[PDB]
């Protein structure tokens, strides 16, 4: 099936085609759908007055994003059928002396860190301001992609391989009360609220700029590379604990159970439980 590859193993040509396909999606008005859907789920609380939302801080975090990526990728392939979504393996970059030296940040791919004299506006790469129009929380143009690697003092480093390995050991998908306080929960740990920010959250913070905030995060195309890695880690977790399943199955908040629709779609967690049936694998499976 479709193979999702480590960013570091992409050809320069596979690289160029992905960037180019993302630019075509932006130009068409399609990319903005993804920014919007994500901000909208972020405001949709399950139940209202609570601190879970459709896409974060609860059991749906993982399948929600798997669905998001699947949809994103099909759109990619409507433009170019040879393109799949790659993943950013940040736990290896965390190894590098200077993470900000990773080739993912090359001018030919995601482009670079922000310019501190311009308020951390990004001015190298295909998504530099003037080449890529971002949208503020309201749905209007915002003036340009920003990034500020490792500057947030609580998230100065990327997650390590050991962080990923320790998460892979948790036997449970998730526990009550199915939120950011869930303990011994693979979901809450991979998401990063288990004494973090760690893993998923930590990467967001580390990148800074739009990636640092929920409502604006997907303005940075690297959002999708980050999330493919989270999805990958979940896929590996499911392979290991083959007899473990999504929790909760029932009785949890509406929108959070195995067969509830995940706003803003009708897709349920159960629809996306098996990634191979969605048509794709990660190169490591292989």
Ligand X SMILES: N[C@@H](Cc1ccc(O)c(O)c1)C(=O)O
By the rule CB under 6 A, 213 interacts with ligand X: yes
Mask for 135-154, x = binds a copy of itself (CB under 8 A): x--xxxx-------------
Check binding of 43 to a copy of itself (CB under 8 A): yes
Q: Single out the residue of 23, 24, 36, 79 in contact with a copy of itself (rule: CB under 8 A).
A: 36
Nearer to ligand X by Cβ, of 76 and 164: the residue is: 164
Neighbours of 97 (CB within 10 A): 6
DSSP, residue by residue, the chain: -EEE-BGGG--HHHHHHHHHHHHHHHHHT-HHHHHHHHHHHHT-BSSTTSS-BSSSSSTTHHHHHHHHHHHHHHHHHHH-TT----B--HHHHTTSSSGGG-GGGSTTTT---EETTTTTEE-SSTTSTTTS--B-TTSSB-S--B--TT-STT--SPPPHHHHHHHHT---S--TT-STT--S-HHHHHHT-SSSS-HHHHHHHHH-GGGGSTTTGGGSTHHHHHHHHHHHHHHHHHHHSTT---S-SSSS-TTTSTTS--TTSS--GGGGS-GGGGTEEETT--
51 contact choice in ligand X, Zn ion, a copy of itself, none (CB below 5 to 8 Å, kind-dependent)? Zn ion
Position 57 contacts Zn ion (CB under 5 A)? yes
Nearer to ligand X by Cβ, of 89 and 260: the residue is 89
Please check if 163 is assigned to a binding site: no
Window 37 to 56, contacts with ligand X (CB under 6 A): 56
Residue among 49 and 81 whose Cβ is closer to Zn ion = 49
State how far the Cα of 93 lies from the Cα of 264, in Å rounded to an integer: 34
Q: Does 26 help bind Zn ion (rule: CB under 5 A)?
A: no
Q: Is 180 in the site for Zn ion (CB under 5 A)?
A: yes
Cα separation of 191 and 206, whole Å?
14
Residue 9 near ligand X by CB under 6 A? yes
The answer to whether the annotation marks 226 as part of a ligand binding site is no
Residue 140 binds which entry of a copy of itself, ligand X, Zn ion, none, CB below 5-8 Å type-dependent: a copy of itself
Point out which span in 32-40, 98-106, 204-212, 271-279 binds a copy of itself (CB under 8 A).
Answer: 32-40
**How many residues interact with ligand X (rule CB under 6 A)?**
16
Among 214, 236, 273, 281, binds ligand X (CB under 6 A): 214
Where on the chain is the footprint of ligand X (CB under 6 A)? 6, 8-9, 56, 89, 92, 192, 197, 201, 204-205, 212-214, 217, 284
Where on the chain is the footprint of Zn ion (CB under 5 A)? 51, 56-57, 179-180, 214
């Amino acid at each position: 099936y479709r193979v999702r590859k480590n960013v570091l193993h992409l050809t320069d040509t596979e690289k160029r085609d992905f960037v180019r396909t993302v630019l075509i999606l932006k130009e068409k008005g399609i990319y903005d759908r993804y920014i919007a859907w994500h901000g909208a789920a972020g405001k949709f609380h399950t139940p209202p007055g609570s601190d879970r939302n459709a896409a974060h801080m609860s059991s749906a975090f993982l399948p929600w994003h798997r669905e998001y990526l699947l949809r994103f990728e099909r759109d990619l392939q409507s433009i170019n059928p040879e393109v799949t979504l790659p993943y950013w393996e940040w736990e290896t970059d965390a190894q590098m002396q200077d993470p900000s030296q990773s080739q993912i940040w090359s001018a030919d791919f995601m482009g670079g860190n922000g310019n501190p004299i311009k308020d951390f506006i990004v001015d190298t790469g295909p998504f530099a301001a003037g080449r890529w129009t971002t949208i503020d929380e309201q749905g209007n143009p915002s003036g340009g992609l920003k990034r500020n690697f490792g500057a947030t003092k609580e998230a100065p480093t990327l997650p390590t391989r050991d962080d990923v390995l320790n998460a892979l050991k948790i036997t449970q998908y998730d526990t009550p009360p199915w939120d950011m306080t869930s303990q011994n929960s693979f979901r809450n740990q991979l998401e990063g609220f288990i004494n973090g920010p760690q893993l998923h959250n930590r990467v967001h913070r580390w990148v800074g700029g739009q990636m640092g905030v929920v409502p604006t995060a997907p303005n940075d195309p690297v959002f999708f590379l980050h999330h493919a890695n989270v999805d990958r880690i979940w896929a590996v977790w499911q392979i290991i604990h083959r007899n473990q399943n999504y929790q909760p199955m029932k009785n949890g908040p509406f929108g959070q159970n195995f067969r509830d629709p995940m706003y803003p779609w009708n897709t349920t967690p159960e629809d996306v439980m098996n990634h191979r049936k969605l048509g794709y694998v990660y190169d490591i499976e292989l």
